[PDB]
Amino acid sequence: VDKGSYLPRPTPPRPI
Amino acid sequence: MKTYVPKQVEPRWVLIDAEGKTLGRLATKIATLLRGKHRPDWTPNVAMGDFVVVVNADKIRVTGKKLEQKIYTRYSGYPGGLKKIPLEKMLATHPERVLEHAVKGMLPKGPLGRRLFKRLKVYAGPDHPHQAQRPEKLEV
Amino acid sequence: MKGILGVKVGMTRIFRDDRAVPVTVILAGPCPVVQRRTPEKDGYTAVQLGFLPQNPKRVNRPLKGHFAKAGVEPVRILREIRDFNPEGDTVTVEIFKPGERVDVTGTSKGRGFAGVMKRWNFAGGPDSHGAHKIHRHPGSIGNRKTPGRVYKGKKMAGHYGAERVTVMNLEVVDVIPEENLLLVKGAVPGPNGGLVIVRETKKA
Amino acid sequence: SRIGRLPIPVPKGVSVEVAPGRVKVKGPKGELEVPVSPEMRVVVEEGVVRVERPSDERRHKSLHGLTRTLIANAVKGVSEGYSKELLIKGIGYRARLVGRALELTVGFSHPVVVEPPEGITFEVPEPTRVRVSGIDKQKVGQVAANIRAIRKPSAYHEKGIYYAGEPVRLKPGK
Amino acid sequence: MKVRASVKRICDKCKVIRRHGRVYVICENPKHKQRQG
RNA sequence: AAGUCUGGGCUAAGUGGUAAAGGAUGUGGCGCCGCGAAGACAGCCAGCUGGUCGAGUGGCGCCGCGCCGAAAAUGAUCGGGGCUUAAGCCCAGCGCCGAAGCUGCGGGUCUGGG
RNA sequence: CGAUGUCGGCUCGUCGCAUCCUGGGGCUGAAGAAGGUCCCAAGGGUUGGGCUGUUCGCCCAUUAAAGCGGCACGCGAGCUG
RNA sequence: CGCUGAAAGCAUCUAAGCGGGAAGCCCGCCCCAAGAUGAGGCCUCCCACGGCAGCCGGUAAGGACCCGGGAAGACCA
Ligand SMILES: [Mg+2]
Ligand SMILES: [Mg+2]
Ligand SMILES: [Mg+2]
Ligand SMILES: [Mg+2]
Ligand SMILES: [Mg+2]
Ligand SMILES: [Mg+2]
Ligand SMILES: [Mg+2]
Ligand SMILES: [Mg+2]
Ligand SMILES: [Mg+2]
Ligand SMILES: [Mg+2]
Ligand SMILES: [Mg+2]
Ligand SMILES: [Mg+2]
Ligand SMILES: [Mg+2]
Ligand SMILES: [Mg+2]
Ligand SMILES: [Mg+2]
Ligand SMILES: [Mg+2]
Ligand SMILES: [Mg+2]
Ligand SMILES: [Mg+2]
Ligand SMILES: [Mg+2]
Ligand SMILES: [Mg+2]
Ligand SMILES: [Mg+2]
Ligand SMILES: [Mg+2]
Ligand SMILES: [Mg+2]
Ligand SMILES: [Mg+2]
Ligand SMILES: [Mg+2]
Ligand SMILES: [Mg+2]
Ligand SMILES: [Mg+2]
Ligand SMILES: [Mg+2]
Ligand SMILES: [Mg+2]
Ligand SMILES: [Mg+2]
Ligand SMILES: [Mg+2]
Ligand SMILES: [Mg+2]
Ligand SMILES: [Mg+2]
Ligand SMILES: [Mg+2]
Ligand SMILES: [Mg+2]
Ligand SMILES: [Mg+2]
Ligand SMILES: [Mg+2]
Ligand SMILES: [Mg+2]
Ligand SMILES: [Mg+2]
Ligand SMILES: [Mg+2]
Ligand SMILES: [Mg+2]
Ligand SMILES: [Mg+2]
Ligand SMILES: [Mg+2]
Ligand SMILES: [Mg+2]
Ligand SMILES: [Mg+2]
Ligand SMILES: [Mg+2]
Ligand SMILES: [Mg+2]
Ligand SMILES: [Mg+2]
Ligand SMILES: [Mg+2]
Ligand SMILES: [Mg+2]
Ligand SMILES: [Mg+2]
Ligand SMILES: [Mg+2]
Ligand SMILES: [Mg+2]
Ligand SMILES: [Mg+2]
Ligand SMILES: [Mg+2]
Ligand SMILES: [Mg+2]
Ligand SMILES: [Mg+2]
Ligand SMILES: [Mg+2]
Ligand SMILES: [Mg+2]
Ligand SMILES: [Mg+2]
Ligand SMILES: [Mg+2]
Ligand SMILES: [Mg+2]
Ligand SMILES: [Mg+2]
Ligand SMILES: [Mg+2]
Ligand SMILES: [Mg+2]
Ligand SMILES: [Mg+2]
Ligand SMILES: [Mg+2]
Ligand SMILES: [Mg+2]
Ligand SMILES: [Mg+2]
Ligand SMILES: [Mg+2]
Ligand SMILES: [Mg+2]
Ligand SMILES: [Mg+2]
Ligand SMILES: [Mg+2]
Ligand SMILES: [Mg+2]
Ligand SMILES: [Mg+2]
Ligand SMILES: [Mg+2]
Ligand SMILES: [Mg+2]
Ligand SMILES: [Mg+2]
Ligand SMILES: [Mg+2]
Ligand SMILES: [Mg+2]
Ligand SMILES: [Mg+2]
Ligand SMILES: [Mg+2]
Ligand SMILES: [Mg+2]
Ligand SMILES: [Mg+2]
Ligand SMILES: [Mg+2]
Ligand SMILES: [Mg+2]
Ligand SMILES: [Mg+2]
Ligand SMILES: [Mg+2]
Ligand SMILES: [Mg+2]
Ligand SMILES: [Mg+2]
Ligand SMILES: [Mg+2]
Ligand SMILES: [Mg+2]
Ligand SMILES: [Mg+2]
Ligand SMILES: [Mg+2]
Ligand SMILES: [Mg+2]
Ligand SMILES: [Mg+2]
Ligand SMILES: [Mg+2]
Ligand SMILES: [Mg+2]
Ligand SMILES: [Mg+2]
Ligand SMILES: [Mg+2]
Ligand SMILES: [Mg+2]
Ligand SMILES: [Mg+2]
Ligand SMILES: [Mg+2]
Ligand SMILES: [Mg+2]
Ligand SMILES: [Mg+2]
Ligand SMILES: [Mg+2]
Ligand SMILES: [Mg+2]
Ligand SMILES: [Mg+2]
Ligand SMILES: [Mg+2]
Ligand SMILES: [Mg+2]
Ligand SMILES: [Mg+2]
Ligand SMILES: [Mg+2]
Ligand SMILES: [Mg+2]
Ligand SMILES: [Mg+2]
Ligand SMILES: [Mg+2]
Ligand SMILES: [Mg+2]
Ligand SMILES: [Mg+2]
Ligand SMILES: [Mg+2]
Ligand SMILES: [Mg+2]
Ligand SMILES: [Mg+2]
Ligand SMILES: [Mg+2]
Ligand SMILES: [Mg+2]
Ligand SMILES: [Mg+2]
Ligand SMILES: [Mg+2]
Ligand SMILES: [Mg+2]
Ligand SMILES: [Mg+2]
Ligand SMILES: [Mg+2]
Ligand SMILES: [Mg+2]
Ligand SMILES: [Mg+2]
Ligand SMILES: [Mg+2]
Ligand SMILES: [Mg+2]
Ligand SMILES: [Mg+2]
Ligand SMILES: [Mg+2]
Ligand SMILES: [Mg+2]
Ligand SMILES: [Mg+2]
Ligand SMILES: [Mg+2]
Ligand SMILES: [Mg+2]
Ligand SMILES: [Mg+2]
Ligand SMILES: [Mg+2]
Ligand SMILES: [Mg+2]
Ligand SMILES: [Zn+2]
């Protein structure tokens, strides 16, 4: 069932 | 002065007729003999107890309704792998395991307890193969 | 219980009452008894059968001894049949008459490292609609923190075939004793030239 | 107000030997042994057997009556013998003997063959009455019960295998 | 059979008997047969 | 590690070792009437009385301990083994074991008095 | 909160039983057949479609039946988005 | 669901005892399996080696290496 959404949609970073 | 610690002794072999005796009350004694705590020079970090031979272990006796109600249990590691076996059936199929399981649970866990367990020789029927060792008949 | 060793030679169909019937032909005879197992000696009842003649150049001394005590020429294969005690010193296809039902054991064909789809008939992944490098993949293998592990016996990729298989209750369609031949209805495990065992069925 | 302490008449000439935990009762129709609680003491008097209990607590009172009746039935067993009679009611329904065996023809697609166990005799007078007989009372009642179970009395119709003297209680039909 | 936590006599011909750790009520009337559970 | 310790009693469910309204000829213990050698209760022979049986019998209340009511998700279990005139529960005892508490012996340091 | 990725689907299951079906029963206002209701039972089984992101639900055509729940509303270092 | 049957003269599947009774339970079928360290069993083969429950060395029965391959196979087996 649709409830909240406690996190943004993710995306990977870039270390260096 | 420091406490006496014995040098290795010749262990004693022992014979017990399990017939008609109560499962747990017999097991209790078999364990003690195994640990050798009947010996005045008892040492907790070495095997110095007796070898215990038991006969007529199929004729062990038990109180209450435990023939039909006591459940021995085994988990195989697989899903739904818990097998259940009642006393009655265990006696019918592997009677010596009854007395063996009881005793094993009353031994210490760990490397020594496992060794002490191996010095236990249980048989169904009145005969045992160790007359070579000439075990001394015990009354318990 | 009765049984014989044999080799799988090949498949055909024959005609019987205006019906085509798929058969697998098996070269079974002849099998010399080379040892008997007895309750007083071994604790159970069976007959060790030899099969196929071997160049005695390749049979070592411990094996030579075994054969000699049975008064039997060197054979390539030894295998037992439990609860079988032929009155004879030699076992042939004649122990099976047409209409009998049999159990045939062989060594299945080996697929080596088999994907979860070939091995376990998994559905695999979709082939379009965004499916990402998972077209032949098995999916989830578990749950989460509880139980936080994977069950024993989880169907997974791995070796497949080249293992002992028994197909049961096959009709004996014919037997051609003069060629040590057995015709069995249907399919038998393993490749042509494969060692197989034929036993009287255990179904009723 | 008591069963165990009521004395058991023993006919001529049936004997009653007594052992621990059992009594043997022989007579003109056969012999059979009666297992008895070791807590109870049976007693061999003149032409009569008595049972006495060691106290007046519950288990002992219960064992008392049972033991007396148990032996009384054994006594009557080897002398008079035991029987039960079965009524076969229903049109197509009938019974007959085939050797020692009993053949029930009672509405199935097949007839049913009941084999008499050891110590049991079958009789078919009319083809609608069956007699189960033997020296063992519990065995007779059991087999009789067995025969009846083949086709218990219908609830709506006077049809099936009946006990002699069992009433025909019925429910209305539509 | 009725299976209830409260098994009672329904008619004067009902009988509260107890077999195998369980309380039953048996009777001439089949409807009155009860087992506690 | 130290009692298979002693004496009286209850429990038969492994209760002990997970729960309620409520239900029950479970078992033990008290209590109160009813009914009966002028023959009660039960069963066999009649119409709540009659006849042969020859003892007890039927209802009510409290108390102890148990029974049911009691279905949930990975493999079970009172911590385990195992325990039934107990290794359970109630009452009364004697003994032991058991901590870095207390004691004995030695030492350190501070404080107070010499 | 110096991160425990959040619905639904797909894949793969596994467990519970308050049981949808199949097996065994008692009662029935159970004639038969077919139902009702409660008891035992978790071994196996529990279909394909239209609509909507849907879970759910409705509908079509069937079925022995088209069970209800737990597993981080099972499963995104397995996929989808 | 019964048989027999007291406590409780009747009755009661139960308190002694005995039956019947599920796709379910245990065997039975198929497959793995003695690291089952509780390491099982049978048949066969070699054998009494030289040096000072150990050591160095040469062999026996046998094993491996290497090669030609293989409906066996990732390598390995
Ligand atoms: Mg929310
Ligand atoms: Mg005892
Ligand atoms: Mg003892
Ligand atoms: Mg001792
Ligand atoms: Mg005893
Ligand atoms: Mg028991
Ligand atoms: Mg698992
Ligand atoms: Mg399983
Ligand atoms: Mg399961
Ligand atoms: Mg389970
Ligand atoms: Mg298992
Ligand atoms: Mg299984
Ligand atoms: Mg410890
Ligand atoms: Mg045999
Ligand atoms: Mg083979
Ligand atoms: Mg594949
Ligand atoms: Mg593949
Ligand atoms: Mg491929
Ligand atoms: Mg493929
Ligand atoms: Mg496949
Ligand atoms: Mg496919
Ligand atoms: Mg597919
Ligand atoms: Mg698909
Ligand atoms: Mg595909
Ligand atoms: Mg993408
Ligand atoms: Mg792609
Ligand atoms: Mg899973
Ligand atoms: Mg875990
Ligand atoms: Mg595996
Ligand atoms: Mg392989
Ligand atoms: Mg067929
Ligand atoms: Mg007909
Ligand atoms: Mg019926
Ligand atoms: Mg009407
Ligand atoms: Mg009900
Ligand atoms: Mg009510
Ligand atoms: Mg009333
Ligand atoms: Mg029962
Ligand atoms: Mg009644
Ligand atoms: Mg004591
Ligand atoms: Mg004692
Ligand atoms: Mg005492
Ligand atoms: Mg209980
Ligand atoms: Mg318990
Ligand atoms: Mg409990
Ligand atoms: Mg409670
Ligand atoms: Mg209460
Ligand atoms: Mg109450
Ligand atoms: Mg009382
Ligand atoms: Mg008076
Ligand atoms: Mg009267
Ligand atoms: Mg309970
Ligand atoms: Mg449950
Ligand atoms: Mg349940
Ligand atoms: Mg639980
Ligand atoms: Mg639970
Ligand atoms: Mg559970
Ligand atoms: Mg569970
Ligand atoms: Mg005491
Ligand atoms: Mg101190
Ligand atoms: Mg000091
Ligand atoms: Mg100081
Ligand atoms: Mg200070
Ligand atoms: Mg000073
Ligand atoms: Mg946070
Ligand atoms: Mg960090
Ligand atoms: Mg962190
Ligand atoms: Mg992080
Ligand atoms: Mg995480
Ligand atoms: Mg879909
Ligand atoms: Mg997918
Ligand atoms: Mg799909
Ligand atoms: Mg699961
Ligand atoms: Mg599920
Ligand atoms: Mg489970
Ligand atoms: Mg319900
Ligand atoms: Mg439905
Ligand atoms: Mg059904
Ligand atoms: Mg059903
Ligand atoms: Mg039904
Ligand atoms: Mg109707
Ligand atoms: Mg009707
Ligand atoms: Mg019907
Ligand atoms: Mg029904
Ligand atoms: Mg319902
Ligand atoms: Mg249920
Ligand atoms: Mg199921
Ligand atoms: Mg399920
Ligand atoms: Mg659909
Ligand atoms: Mg759709
Ligand atoms: Mg939808
Ligand atoms: Mg879901
Ligand atoms: Mg809904
Ligand atoms: Mg909706
Ligand atoms: Mg709508
Ligand atoms: Mg249909
Ligand atoms: Mg239907
Ligand atoms: Mg649907
Ligand atoms: Mg529904
Ligand atoms: Mg579901
Ligand atoms: Mg869930
Ligand atoms: Mg979560
Ligand atoms: Mg949730
Ligand atoms: Mg989820
Ligand atoms: Mg929640
Ligand atoms: Mg779901
Ligand atoms: Mg789900
Ligand atoms: Mg997740
Ligand atoms: Mg994940
Ligand atoms: Mg992702
Ligand atoms: Mg997702
Ligand atoms: Mg993760
Ligand atoms: Mg009756
Ligand atoms: Mg009777
Ligand atoms: Mg009677
Ligand atoms: Mg009587
Ligand atoms: Mg009984
Ligand atoms: Mg009892
Ligand atoms: Mg039975
Ligand atoms: Mg019957
Ligand atoms: Mg079937
Ligand atoms: Mg092997
Ligand atoms: Mg094998
Ligand atoms: Mg080995
Ligand atoms: Mg092996
Ligand atoms: Mg090995
Ligand atoms: Mg082991
Ligand atoms: Mg062996
Ligand atoms: Mg070996
Ligand atoms: Mg062996
Ligand atoms: Mg051999
Ligand atoms: Mg020599
Ligand atoms: Mg030599
Ligand atoms: Mg020398
Ligand atoms: Mg060497
Ligand atoms: Mg060589
Ligand atoms: Mg090569
Ligand atoms: Mg190659
Ligand atoms: Mg290959
Ligand atoms: Mg290589
Ligand atoms: Zn009633």
UniProtKB/Swiss-Prot annotation, chain A:
GO terms for cellular component: extracellular region. This is Pyrrhocoricin. Keywords: Antibiotic, Antimicrobial, Glycoprotein, Immunity, Innate immunity, Secreted. Belongs to the drosocin family. Glycans are attached at T11. O-linked glycan consists of a Gal-GalNAc disaccharide, O-glycosylation is essential for full biological activity. Residues 9-16 have a biased composition (Pro residues). Residues 1-16 are annotated as: Disordered. It is found in: Secreted. The lineage of its organism: Eukaryota, Metazoa, Ecdysozoa, Arthropoda, Hexapoda. It comes from Pyrrhocoris apterus. Antibacterial peptide. Affects Gram-negative bacteria E.coli 1106, P.aeruginosa, E.coli D22 and E.cloacae and Gram-positive bacteria M.luteus and B.subtilis. GO terms for biological process: defense response to bacterium; innate immune response.
From Swiss-Prot, chain B:
One of its GO terms (molecular function) is mRNA binding. Keywords: Ribonucleoprotein, Ribosomal protein. SUPFAM superfamilies: Ribosomal protein L13. InterPro entries: Ribosomal_uL13, Ribosomal_uL13_bac-type, Ribosomal_uL13_CS, Ribosomal_uL13_sf. GO terms for biological process: negative regulation of translation; translation. GO terms for cellular component: cytosolic large ribosomal subunit. The keyword Membrane does not apply. Transmembrane segments: none annotated. The keyword Transport does not apply. Signal peptide: none annotated. Disulfide bonds: none annotated. Coiled coil: none annotated. Belongs to the universal ribosomal protein uL13 family. PANTHER family: LARGE RIBOSOMAL SUBUNIT PROTEIN UL13M, RIBOSOMAL PROTEIN L13. Part of the 50S ribosomal subunit. This protein is one of the early assembly proteins of the 50S ribosomal subunit, although it is not seen to bind rRNA by itself. It is important during the early stages of 50S assembly. This is Large ribosomal subunit protein uL13. It comes from Thermus thermophilus (strain ATCC 27634 / DSM 579 / HB8).
Swiss-Prot record, chain C:
NCBIfam families: L3_bact. PANTHER family: 50S RIBOSOMAL PROTEIN L3 (PTHR11229), LARGE RIBOSOMAL SUBUNIT PROTEIN UL3C (PTHR11229:SF16). Keywords: Methylation, Ribonucleoprotein, Ribosomal protein, RNA-binding, rRNA-binding. This is Large ribosomal subunit protein uL3. One of the primary rRNA binding proteins, it binds directly near the 3'-end of the 23S rRNA, where it nucleates assembly of the 50S subunit. Belongs to the universal ribosomal protein uL3 family. The keyword Transcription does not apply. GO terms for molecular function: rRNA binding; structural constituent of ribosome.
From Swiss-Prot, chain D:
It comes from the Bacteria. The keyword rRNA-binding applies. GO terms for biological process: cytoplasmic translation. InterPro entries: Ribosomal_uL6-like, Ribosomal_uL6-like_a/b-dom_sf, Ribosomal_uL6_a/b-dom, Ribosomal_uL6_bac-type. The keyword rRNA-binding applies. GO terms for molecular function: rRNA binding; structural constituent of ribosome. Transmembrane segments: none annotated. Keywords: Ribonucleoprotein, Ribosomal protein, RNA-binding, rRNA-binding. GO terms for cellular component: cytosolic large ribosomal subunit. Part of the 50S ribosomal subunit. Belongs to the universal ribosomal protein uL6 family. PANTHER family: 60S/50S RIBOSOMAL PROTEIN L6/L9 (PTHR11655), LARGE RIBOSOMAL SUBUNIT PROTEIN UL6M (PTHR11655:SF14). This protein binds to the 23S rRNA, and is important in its secondary structure. It is located near the subunit interface in the base of the L7/L12 stalk, and near the tRNA binding site of the peptidyltransferase center. This is Large ribosomal subunit protein uL6. The gene is rplF.
